[PDB]
Amino acid sequence: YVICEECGKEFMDSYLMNHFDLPTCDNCRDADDKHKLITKTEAKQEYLLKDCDLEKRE
DNA sequence: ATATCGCACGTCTATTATCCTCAGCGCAATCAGCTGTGACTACCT
Ligand SMILES: [Zn+2]
Numbered sequence: 321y322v323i324c325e326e327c328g329k330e331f332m333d334s335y336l337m338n339h340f341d342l343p344t345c346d347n348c349r350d351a352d353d354k355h356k357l358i359t360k361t362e363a364k365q366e367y368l369l370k371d372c373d374l375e376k377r378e
Numbered sequence: 379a380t381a382t383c384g385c386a387c388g389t390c391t392a393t394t395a396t397c398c399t400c401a402g403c404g405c406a407a408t409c410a411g412c413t414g415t416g417a418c419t420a421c422c423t
Contacts, residue, residue, distance in 0.1 A: 361402065371404095 324348055 321330040322337055326348035336342040336349055349355055363369060 359402070 321332055322334070322343050323330050324345040324347075325343050327345065329345060329347070331337075331345040334345045334349070336344045336346070336355065342355075344355075351357070358366075360374070363374075364371075
């Protein structure tokens, strides 16, 4: 069981946990604004992040 | 002997499913910075 950091309700499997190891249930999944997904190139341009920093930094 | 049916000879029209120019992401062309070799030119105390 995984405890959600937003609502506190324990959940077993969720989309956020499965795809990004984020301890948040689908009920609290704010994919609109808080959990918005962006392309790799856009993130690299905005945050000046390199490939290694996105793949090799623990 | 003269109109009439079978045969042929085409020709107009169509009851109906094709080829062009705009989009992220990763490997390669590009560039600033630094240095190495050689001789040159000069400048201060
Ligand atoms: Zn939750």
